[PDB]
Nucleic acid binder design. Sequence first.
DNA 1: ACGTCCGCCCGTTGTTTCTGTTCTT
DNA 2: AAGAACAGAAACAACGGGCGGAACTATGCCGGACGT
RNA 3: UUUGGCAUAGUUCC
Lengths: 78, 147, 209, 101, 592
Amino acid sequence: KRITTPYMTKYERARVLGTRALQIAMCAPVMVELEGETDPLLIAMKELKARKIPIIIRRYLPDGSYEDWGVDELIITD
Amino acid sequence: GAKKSAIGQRIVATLPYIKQEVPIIIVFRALGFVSDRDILEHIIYDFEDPEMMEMVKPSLDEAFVIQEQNVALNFIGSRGAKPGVTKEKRIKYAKEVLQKEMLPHVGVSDFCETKKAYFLGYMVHRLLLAALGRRELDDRDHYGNKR
Amino acid sequence: DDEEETYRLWKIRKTIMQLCHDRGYLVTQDGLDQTLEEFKAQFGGKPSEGRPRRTDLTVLVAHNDDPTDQMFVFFPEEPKVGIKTIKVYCQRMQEENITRALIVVQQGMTPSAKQSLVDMAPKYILEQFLQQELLINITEHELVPEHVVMTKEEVTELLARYKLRENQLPRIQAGDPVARYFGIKRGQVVKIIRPSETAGRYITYRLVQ
Amino acid sequence: KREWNLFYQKQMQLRDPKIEEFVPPCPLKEASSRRIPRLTVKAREHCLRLLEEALSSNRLRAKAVELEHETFRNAKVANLYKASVLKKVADIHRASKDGQP
Amino acid sequence: ESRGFVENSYLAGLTPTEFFFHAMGGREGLIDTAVKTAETGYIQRRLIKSMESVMVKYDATVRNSINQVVQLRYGEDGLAGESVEFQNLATLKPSNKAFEKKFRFDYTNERALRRTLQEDLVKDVLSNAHIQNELEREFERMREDREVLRVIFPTGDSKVVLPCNLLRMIWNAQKIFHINPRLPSDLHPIKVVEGVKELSKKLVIVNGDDPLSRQAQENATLLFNIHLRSTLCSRRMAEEFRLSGEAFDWLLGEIESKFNQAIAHPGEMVGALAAQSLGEPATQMNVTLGVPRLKELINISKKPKTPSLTVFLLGQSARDAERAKDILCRLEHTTLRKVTANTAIYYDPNPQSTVVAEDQEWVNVYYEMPRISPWLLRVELDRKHMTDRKLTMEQIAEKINAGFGDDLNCIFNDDNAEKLVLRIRIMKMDDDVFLRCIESNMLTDMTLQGIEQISKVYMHLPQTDNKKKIIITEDGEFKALQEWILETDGVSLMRVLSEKDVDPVRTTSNDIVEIFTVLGIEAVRKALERELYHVISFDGSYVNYRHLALLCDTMTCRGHLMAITRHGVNRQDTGPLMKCSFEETVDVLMEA
DNA sequence: ACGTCCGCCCGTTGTTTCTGTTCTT
DNA sequence: AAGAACAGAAACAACGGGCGGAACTATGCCGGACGT
RNA sequence: UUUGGCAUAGUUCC
């Protein structure tokens, strides 16, 4: 039973993109076939569009509990 | 309270180098004038002004006690920068203050009382005129009042 | 004047009737709605040297959930209510087996009397209301949104639903005018229902503490 | 300040002899009643005679007693009741000057 | 010309006196520019410190750093500020007959049916009965929503701010699907009703299924659902918009998408947003308005610079000027000095031979029918002021008797004579000094009429739609009425409310502490919001209501007024490190 | 050639004052 | 019918902290006397 | 390839 919103907020999107770009720039495997791209931010955005970013977001409720949402499961608004 | 409500307004003077305020009749007596007629000659120039006379009456009602130059000087000097342990030194300090630090521009010689009394009376008279609404209060921003 | 005194007594009585109706006690429609002439006829149109003498106007009424739980509305005849007057009222309550009572004061109560009212709180509950505070009903003012006192079953359900500890709710002082109007102790939770400009309605909650 | 009321009542205690008692009678209504503050039979008969003179000058003793008893019932103390009877005598005097019955 | 009216234009030039006067005029503008800046910056800093840690949690509630609830839904509806638009409700203002004609969907005339709806649909509408029952139930729901709207919005204001622009969405649908408005459509009004009902279920602000959660969601989306039903009414769809099946489906999809996009994202710093949004207008900002008023409202003082108390009258006093002036007299303080003409203290021991020849007859009449002191206190009352307030010498005498008891004597003339005379005699402790204290007290402490601390009371007809009484006629319209409203100086709210012939509902002041101590905390919140709205909107500017609501809730969250100062900031049970950075560092750290 | 002595606002806390209670005579 | 000790609440006076944001030049000054 | 500070005055921009 998960009650938090099913959309990915702007802050979650920004942090996911930054962390994934850093991970790629630190010489890590990608989950998409780059068609000529070289910028880690561009590759991270491509992965987010493809729903292949391997991150699970841990959302802390104010009462101490938490919920784990994968990037695949969250509707990507922007 | 009842006595303050009946008195209304009183006129006091803040002499320099003195601990707190002094009623004006005390200072006038300390200058050497005893009679209310003479003090009112120094203050109210035209005696056909009953409103001015009534305005100055509560100030004279503080003269019910003090009646002499020696005791007036004692009362003035009681509140010096360093209050004395004796009385002659306090009275000498009071005379020194009234001769040296009160209105230096009028004079500092020994016989300056006859003119210091007139100028202090003029200050009180102008205060009465201001209180009666007969002259406009000054403004500090007027450039004739600057140097 | 006699007319003004009758008017003040009538207004105080009407406000107390409204207060009892809000507190859940059983006050009938005719008692709630009395015209000035009806009150004049029923209990004297002449106060000074007349039938209404700030006595016989005391109200005894039973709560809608328990006829055994009843409340008094006493009218002291003294501008400054005293320790002996409070003792007399507590004696009357003890003999009639009544737990709660209201006391409308002409001008005020001495601090000794107020402390002697506070002391017997578990034994008896008595509240002081000034004569000026009841000429109007503060609840009817348009600035005051509707207040509802919540039962301890609903408080528990609310806390469980939002997963809140009672420290985490907004607060309302026990000396608040509306809190005194509703007679609320510390630890009870009131519900505020008010219209909204951006939603159309908004329900808040306040903890009396 | 509230100190005024203490000063004032002190000065009025210092303004003692005992207050004079009421004595019963008289043509006036309820004239044996001591209930009107500072009232006496002589003050009531003086007010009734004033009302009778005004009504007779405008023109009967029943109307004079009715005006006195109404005014003694409505006024706070007998000293104000007498002043209000003299006020009603002055109003009857304006009616007679206007020629009104 | 003497007092500085420049007759010339800048092209013609200014004569020397006008030049100097113009320089004097421009100096004030330069001074105000150089002065307002620091105060505006300080106000903004205080607001930011007050609301720096208020956030939107994943619970959707609004809580501060100590997880104390400020709002159960942000902005009381749960939406984000930058996604909402101005819209009109279009079912609040119309009268009963116009409302029924515009929203009823007459299915009986059948010629309008043949003209607007298609032939295969008109037969269905005229044959079915379940369709007709649903269409009547829709209008019933709309009428109930109309009554709810009229309760929420008195004074008849249609303009409102809501997230989805339904009319522009309908226009876009018409242009996208090439709808021709001159032809009958293929949209079934039952399909319209069912589509709206199903759509309203997908617009969820409060998630849950308990009665509490369902009530919360209904309250959170009431206004928008009312607007949605009013716009997508079946008769309006059939007459005005003339949509189609696919067009209606696309419209519903777009409404869902836009509503879901216009929801506040958890993690927003709404407290800092509100601080900036309310403090940035301050740099561009007979009562006080603007920066001083904002300073007073933020740091509440018990002595406002210009306290006021607007008073509304109940009945015929509101219309007729007679009782209006009567209430004006009742509500204005007046001692004996306001009406006295002159006074004097005499020495007259003889009751008969009186020094003053005027009182002779009536003083003799008083004394002829009966110790005392020989001194006198003779006062003279000004006729103009005596007759202006509708006062009476008997009233003055009885007030004196109440104030002093029977230890005084009082004899008074009447208005018949040109000279109105009052004579007072007493029935250490010497007489002259006692009589001067009696006169002084009796002239500055008498309180003949009025309410204490109420200095001056005005009386003028309103000229604004918020200070006027607006009712609903029997035909359902809004009609504006002009009734006399008072505006006093100095505040004493409880007595004015308790006064006879004074409206106890609409009477209000502008002293926040008074509103608190008289009416509670919720009333103080509402009044504080109204005062902030007035000061902000005096300049014609607009600030979103969410920020106002957030500031007011932050100030009045803990049950007592919390001024935004060091006192209020440190009154919070927060960590010492948040307080140390604000107006007290060493003291707070050492105390902790 | 170094080393010794000499201009405005308003929240706290104090001081002082003014009534109420209870016991005793 | 009177008197005293104690205690709760309040009016006035004195005290202390608080008062915009950035940025760029320049100029004066950082203790004094002494002789064994 | 290494780092003085305190005060006062003037000026720029809202």
